[PDB]
């Protein structure tokens with residue numbers, strides 16, 4: 001009847017569910033399974049409410065989940081989903097390697113380009129102002145509605161998604177051996 | 193890279209999380225930990241969305257969670273929370289023993305009495321009409337605003353909560369050895 005030991009067991013189990021749901025979210029994002037992504041995101045968000053003290057590893061896990069959530073809502077606070085993804089990306093405790101900078105740059109341009117794709121050019125300019133010769137050339141492209149300019153074709157949505165999926169594959173392999181998924185695959189392999 | 197085996201592992205893990213969250217919900221309800229109950233309920237509801245095919249045991253688990261959720265919202269569809277708890281209680285695949293009938297009767301009267309406690313006597317009559325010499329005596333009590341009649345004092349909110357908590361203790365012991373909580377308590381005992 002020890003309430004403290006029970007709360008401790010509940011916190012250990014919340015940590016296991018968090019890693020399992022991050023793994024599931026990464027796979028759904030990689031596979032393009034939108035409805036499964038939406039369901040796993042709702043589950044991860046609820047499970048995270050059962051945690052009040054997080055380790056550095058757990059903080060990185062929750063911010064990766066938040067970041068992918070903004071990326072998945074990219075084509076849909078007073079900022080756009082892709083602007084929110086950029087704020088999380090720039091503050092996650094991670095190495096600022098070549099891949100990090102590539103994703104950062106692709107998000108910055110796509111935060112503008114998704115507004116143009118949606119036909120909201122005033123919003124495209126407001127996004128540009130909040131993020132940013134280069135600047136005056138990018139603002140002229142938005143102003144001229146030059147949505148299919150070679151610059152936008154190189155810093156494309158598909159290229160942003162491909163680079164982010166490559167990062168998702170590293171998270172997926174770094175968490176492939178976490179307790180809950182490993183025990184669950186063991187049960188499935190035993191059946192069989 | 194087998195998507196089917198991964199989805200199978202995700203379903204096995206959803207089953208484990210469901211039993212763990214039912215256990216956690218039962219403890220919070222027994223302890224009167226309202227905020228913890230609200231958080232565990234949100235988590236259970238989200239996790240249950242990741243399941244599309246349930247066994248008879250899993251159906252009983254989800255309906256116990258739904259039932260306690262209605263009981264916890266009892267003093268707050270075109271029916272009241274306690275009327276919804278009654279519909280679930282009468283349809284759960286379980287034995288209709290003495291305890292089942294006691295809980296059923298206490299809920300039926302409290303579904304009326306919580307409306308009187310809230311000062312909504314028109315709603316108390318509408319609840320009576322939907323659920324129901326005995327009937328004409330119960331309707332006269334509502335009509336006379338006889339909230340503290342000896343009948344209401346014997347079929348009280350506290351007596352309803354005590355009887356439901358006794359049932360919760362049976363669910364709690366029947367699920368005490370489920371995979372996730374057992375593995376989590378093992379980690380906690382190892383630290384100590």
Ligand SMILES: CN(C)C(=O)COc1cccc(F)c1
Nearest residue numbers: 040041044045048065066069
């Ligand atoms: C701060 N908010 C409201 C969010 O970022 C919601 O998104 C989330 C949150 C946690 C996990 C997840 F998978 C998604």
Ligand SMILES: CN(C)C(=O)COc1cccc(F)c1
Nearest residue numbers: 104105106108109134135155
């Ligand atoms: C001289 N300057 C500022 C440049 O040519 C950099 O261009 C870029 C390209 C992509 C993203 C970005 F945010 C900036």
Ligand SMILES: CN(C)C(=O)COc1cccc(F)c1
Nearest residue numbers: 232233236237240257258261
């Ligand atoms: C049918 N609805 C919307 C509900 O009953 C919500 O309540 C729930 C649902 C599942 C688990 C739980 F713990 C609570």
Ligand SMILES: CN(C)C(=O)COc1cccc(F)c1
Nearest residue numbers: 296297298300301326327347
């Ligand atoms: C002759 N009759 C109908 C009775 O005296 C039963 O009284 C009850 C008592 C509690 C709950 C309930 F629903 C009914």
